[PDB]
Design a protein around this nucleic acid. Structure first.
Ligand SMILES: [Mg+2]
Ligand SMILES: [Mg+2]
Ligand SMILES: [Mg+2]
Ligand SMILES: [Mg+2]
Ligand SMILES: [Mg+2]
Ligand SMILES: [Zn+2]
Lengths: 221, 83, 83, 129, 135, 220, 24, 71, 102
RNA sequence: AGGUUCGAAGACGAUCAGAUACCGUCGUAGUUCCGACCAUAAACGAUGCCGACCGGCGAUGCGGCGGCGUUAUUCCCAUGACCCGCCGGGCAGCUUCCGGGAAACCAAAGUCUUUGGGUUCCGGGGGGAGUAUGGUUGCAAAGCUGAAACUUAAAGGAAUUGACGG
């Protein structure tokens, strides 16, 4: 996105800094080197937020180019992102796959679990290498949410934000959903989106089993 | 194709990779052809027409697919020059 | 990266690369003016000098040859020649 | 040691072409290399190439257009008469519809079709198709 | 020893649990009395073995979300997933502890000089990396 | 009676895709043999190349399965070679026929020189490699026919090539590898880039996006 | 046999042959 | 590898003619001792006198008395 | 067939490595080829620590450790079960087995 | 010269159907040093040398260069010991659909039918045979060069299944 309306806003910058999504790993992939700003004294690589925004806009243009919203598939094998891809598919009408991605989903045409999408979006290339390689048998262009040390073997629209922080993953997924909705005739580009970014955040079970009762005690008293 | 008489004697013309300028084979299932939907200048909304990029299987197996897509989008104007 | 610009490398990788393996060879050394305290004259000394440089007006050593660079004696001022 | 500068340059160009690179650097430049690249570029197999000129033998950065299959060399510069140019032409070229064989002639460094046009032979240099 | 159940009983027990979770209970005899009309079991021994596994699986269900599908368990899961967005976001922090290098990155991005950012003092020592090898 | 489970197969069945070259343009894999017999109906000739009895030693002696090599292709520029091994000869034959139908590749025909009419020979010398068998297909003038060993001769004949010089190296007695190397050589006639293909390719709509509404209505 | 022991046997035989030839 | 110089023809022909002695066909045909050992002496046929009639036992998997003549 | 890339020894940029005698059978084994085990064992058995502590003249006496380095030819190493045959893929990892601290 | 240990030969004791061996005891030549021979090893990376190109990563040894800092003395910088990088040459290692190969595997065993950077040595089915003979070196043992008659349809290499394993 080269336009002035298609620019990162201060609210977006604040979300990005609060959720993290710029503190990469200590390892740098040579094909991810073009997204890094600088390496800290901690060894943590600092990812350029503008390059991340540009790649996210490129991914949004790739996604909205498909007439059937069901033809794009979102996969998160790791738990930190399954809720994000579920909410993303619910908002955008995509087809989600969470948890164990069974082999032969895109290639073995016999089982009913077989499906052939027109776009692949991946939370993490290391966690989701199995849908990555299978996408190479069916002519499937791929988007992935790649970190500084993510391999880029079968990735096409690699977004350099993060894959480790749950807050960062929820934020990047919510941001992608908001962008692909604003590109289509869904959001009016003026008021902020009514969907809170916390909705996409993965929560560890010891929060689910204590937060609801803490909130119940606060409400009842 | 295109013998002396002029007609194109070849039953198809294959696509060439938009990065490596390589012929995408008939059985090269690793190849892709994605569409990047450009928006209008004023509201940033999809306007129906788009632009198309094709990558051969060799490039997007050695890993250089993302760089090629970014370069083509930069050249065509999708990505701003200040990237 | 399939499209590294070999014609116009930025000065950072130009300076990190080996002197022979640069686009054009450039020596890593330089010439320096050396001020010995208590003396007015100025001696032009090679940055990688292999010999002990002495002031012709004072029996003082200015640099001690080492493996890579002549280590200047303490208290001695130095500056560059035309970058 | 290096005994054929042109062979090294052609091998570097071929390797960079095979690896999908957009630009190749060949370290030892020479008049023969510049003329060979001129023939290749005028036939459209390569793009513009720029000569980096140091006070030693210069370097060349060539813009690869991706439409090159092979740019090999014939190392012993065999004398090629016009009577035996056809055997060379059907031993080194993939077909008769495309491919060029560059040989250094008395009239200069030029491909085989120009040599046959002006009726002269010479010493073989290399082939590119 | 050798009391292990087979696929025939386990799959049928899971199916009749996920079809008739409301009617089933923790009593073995009640379950073996509902089986004859909610299912067709050719043998009495097979029927009561299925009922026993149903009792065990419903004990496991009431003590935890077994992989067997359950509409009440799934609606609880749905309520616990697509809700509990906190009334205040987790990303609207008043102050953000920012790296000076990231501050320079934001400055070059042109989004520097923001009142919500607090510049951290960068650490000194460069002592990351685990020690190499054993010992 | 053919019920397809594929977007591509569904588009083929309901008259949405007209030519096999339309599929070949986008490199879409064919995953069911009932796609092409709709296209190459009654024109796909069939020939069984060899029946070889592979064996696997077990506790109670050895058991034998029959590996069938089937090469098919209309004599117009399409060819395919399938290899299937099964217990029964007929089952292996049918499986190899289906696989040869699946691995149907297009063949590029060129001219030896002085392009006059329909092309007759390979556009340039192509090399196929499989195991230790190396097969090279050299362009030949009109009327020379296919000069080669019989096993590649029939495969080149059914591929639409009229004239071709052939040079083979290695253990050509290995009929499976020998046929597969020639098939690989035939396949990469388009994988070779030639100056008449140097024009910048124009991109058309993929059938998946061109017929996505009809796919949604029909291919549920 | 082991190749080394065939070598040793051949060396013994060669010495015997040399001795017999020298005896003439 | 092999030499490829413009004036290496002497070494190439020398190495070819030196290495040509290492295949059985050329050594047999050009050494001359195989001709000496051949009873026919380079002839297609020969005439002889039957000294005896002998039977030759067949090889191991077969079993027959091959009827030969000592000539 | 070449079973191991390193030929089962650590000699990389050397011509000759001095031999050592196997602690079990006194076989001349190259030093970089022999299996080395550095056992650090209590000089008394874990069953006898209490009795020695009771019969000690000192109150807080720290019992000595025993430091013995063992070298084995691969024959004695395999026969003594310190090393075991591994699958073709499982031969490639060099990480020692865990100490089983818990 | 010297000879402590070990230990060909040898002696004895065991084991065994036999046991000229494996095990044990003893023990010569030798193993040690100096001088003179010999020139052979699975002398191996079973992989010629020089040169160019073609992936990534983390280390390691040497030299040099640049940097927060900790440490040694001292008052500070030098200079050592660490920490983080860069460059050059090495021993290597991990990963890779670069590519190759029959495969094992190899970033060289790649850049090879799209066959040509320069050059050296060398193989032509298995045996006979590294034998005979000749020549030559050596005190000797032996080293180097090295056939033929005849015989044979296989011998071999890598991998798969099975069987078997003191
Ligand atoms: Mg073995
Ligand atoms: Mg050695
Ligand atoms: Mg003794
Ligand atoms: Mg050479
Ligand atoms: Mg032989
Ligand atoms: Zn031992």
């Amino acid at each position: 996105g080269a336009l002035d309306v298609l620019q990162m806003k201060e609210e977006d910058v604040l979300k990005f800094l609060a959720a993290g999504t710029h503190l990469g790993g200590t390892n740098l992939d040579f094909q991810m080197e073009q997204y890094i700003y600088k390496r800290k004294s901690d060894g943590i690589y600092i990812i350029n937020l503008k390059r991340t925004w540009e790649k996210l806009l490129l991914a949004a243009r790739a996604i909205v180019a498909i007439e059937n919203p069901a033809d794009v598939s979102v996969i998160s094998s790791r738990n930190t992102g399954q809720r994000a891809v579920l909410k993303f598919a619910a908002a955008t009408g995509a087809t989600p796959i969470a948890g164990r991605f069974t082999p032969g989903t895109f290639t073995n045409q016999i089982q009913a679990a077989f499906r052939e999408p027109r776009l692949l979006v991946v939370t993490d290339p290391r966690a989701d290498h199995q849908p990555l390689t299978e996408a190479s048998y069916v002519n499937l262009p791929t988007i992935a949410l790649c970190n500084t040390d993510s391999p880029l073997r079968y990735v096409d629209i690699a977004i350099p934000c993060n894959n480790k922080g749950a807050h960062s993953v929820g934020l990047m997924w919510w941001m992608l959903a908001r962008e692909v909705l604003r590109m289509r005739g869904t959001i009016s580009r003026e008021h902020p989106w009514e969907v809170m970014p916390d909705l996409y955040f993965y929560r560890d079970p010891e929060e689910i089993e204590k937060e609801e009762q803490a909130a119940a005690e606060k409400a009842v008293t | 194709m295109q013998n002396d008489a002029g007609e194109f004697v070849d039953l198809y013309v294959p696509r060439k990779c938009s990065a490596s300028n390589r012929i995408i084979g008939a059985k090269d299932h690793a190849s892709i052809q994605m569409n990047v939907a450009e928006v209008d200048k004023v509201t940033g909304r999809f306007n129906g027409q788009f632009k198309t990029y094709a990558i051969c299987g060799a490039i997007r197996r050695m890993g250089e697919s993302d760089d090629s897509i970014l370069r083509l989008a930069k050249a065509d104007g999708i990505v701003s020059k200040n990237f | 990266p399939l499209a590294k610009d070999l014609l116009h490398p930025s000065p950072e990788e130009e300076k990190r690369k080996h002197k022979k393996k640069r686009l054009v060879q450039s020596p890593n050394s330089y010439f320096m003016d050396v001020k010995c305290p208590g003396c007015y004259k100025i001696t032009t000394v090679f940055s990688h000098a292999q010999t002990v440089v002495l002031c012709v007006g004072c029996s003082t050593v200015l640099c001690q040859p080492t493996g890579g660079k002549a280590r200047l004696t303490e208290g001695c001022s130095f500056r560059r020649k035309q970058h | 040691v290096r005994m054929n500068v042109l062979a090294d340059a052609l091998k570097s160009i071929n390797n960079a072409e095979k690896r999908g690179k957009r630009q190749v650097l060949i370290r030892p430049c020479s008049k023969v290399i510049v003329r060979f690249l001129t023939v290749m570029m005028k036939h459209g197999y390569i793009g513009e190439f720029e000569i980096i000129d140091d006070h030693r033998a210069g370097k060349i950065v060539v813009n690869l257009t991706g439409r090159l299959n092979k740019c090999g060399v014939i190392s012993p510069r065999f004398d090629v008469q016009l009577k035996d140019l056809e055997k060379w032409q059907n031993n080194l070229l993939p077909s008769r519809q495309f491919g060029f064989i560059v040989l250094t002639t008395s009239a200069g460094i030029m491909d085989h079709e120009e040599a046959r046009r002006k009726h002269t032979g010479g010493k073989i240099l290399g082939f590119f198709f | 020893m050798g009391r292990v159940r087979t696929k025939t009983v386990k799959k049928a027990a899971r199916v009749i649990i996920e079809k008739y979770y409301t009617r089933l209970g923790n009593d073995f005899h009640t379950n073996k009395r509902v089986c004859e009309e909610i299912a067709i079991i050719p043998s009495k021994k097979l029927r009561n073995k299925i009922a026993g596994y149903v009792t065990h699986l419903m004990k496991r269900i009431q003590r935890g979300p077994v992989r067997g599908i359950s509409i009440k368990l799934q609606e609880e899961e749905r309520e616990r997933r697509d809700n509990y967005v906190p009334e205040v976001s987790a990303l609207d922090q008043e102050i953000i502890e920012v790296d000076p290098d990231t501050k320079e990155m934001l400055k070059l991005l042109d989004f520097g000089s923001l009142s919500n950012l607090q510049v951290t003092q960068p650490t000194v020592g460069m002592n990351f990396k685990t020690p190499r090898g054993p010992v | 009676e053919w019920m397809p489970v594929t977007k591509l197969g569904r588009l083929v069945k309901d008259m949405k895709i007209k030519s096999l070259e339309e599929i070949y343009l986008f490199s879409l894999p064919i995953k069911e043999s009932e796609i092409i017999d709709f296209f190459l109906g009654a024109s796909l000739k069939d020939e069984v190349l060899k029946i070889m009895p592979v064996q696997k030693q077990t506790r109670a002696g050895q058991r034998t399965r029959f590996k069938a090599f089937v090469a098919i292709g209309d004599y117009n520029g399409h060819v395919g070679l399938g290899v299937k091994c099964s217990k029964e000869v007929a089952t292996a034959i049918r499986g190899a026929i289906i696989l040869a139908k699946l691995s149907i590749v297009p063949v590029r025909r060129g001219y030896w020189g002085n392009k006059i009419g329909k092309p007759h020979t390979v556009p340039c010398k192509v090399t196929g490699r499989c195991g230790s068998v190396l097969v090279r297909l050299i362009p030949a003038p009109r009327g020379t026919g296919i000069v080669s060993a019989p096993v590649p001769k029939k495969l080149l004949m059914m591929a639409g090539i009229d004239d071709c010089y052939t040079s083979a190296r290695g253990c050509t007695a290995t009929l499976g590898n020998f046929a597969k190397a020639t098939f690989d050589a035939i396949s990469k006639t388009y994988s070779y880039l030639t100056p008449d293909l140097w024009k910048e390719t124009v991109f058309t709509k993929s059938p998946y996006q061109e017929f996505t509404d009809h796919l949604v209505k029909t291919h549920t | 046999m082991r190749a080394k022991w065939r070598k040793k046997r051949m060396r013994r035989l060669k010495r015997k042959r040399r001795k017999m030839r020298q005896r003439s | 590898g092999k030499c490829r110089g413009l004036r290496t023809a002497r070494k190439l022909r020398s190495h070819r003619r030196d290495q040509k002695w290492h295949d059985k066909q050329y050594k047999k045909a050009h050494l001359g001792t195989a001709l000496k050992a051949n009873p026919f002496g380079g002839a297609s046929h020969a005439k002889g006198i039957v000294l005896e009639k002998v039977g030759v036992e067949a090889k191991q998997p077969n079993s027959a008395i091959r009827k030969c003549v000592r000539v | 067939t070449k079973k191991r890339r390193n030929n089962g020894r650590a000699k990389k940029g050397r011509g000759h490595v001095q031999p050592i005698r196997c602690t079990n059978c006194a076989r001349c084994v190259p030093k970089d080829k022999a299996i080395k085990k550095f056992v650090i064992r209590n000089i008394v058995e874990a069953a006898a620590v209490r009795d020695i502590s009771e019969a000690s003249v000192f109150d807080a006496y720290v019992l000595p450790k025993l430091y013995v380095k063992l070298h084995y030819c691969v024959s004695c190493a395999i026969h003594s079960k310190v090393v075991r045959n591994r699958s073709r893929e499982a031969r490639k990892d060099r990480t020692p087995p865990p100490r089983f601290r818990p």
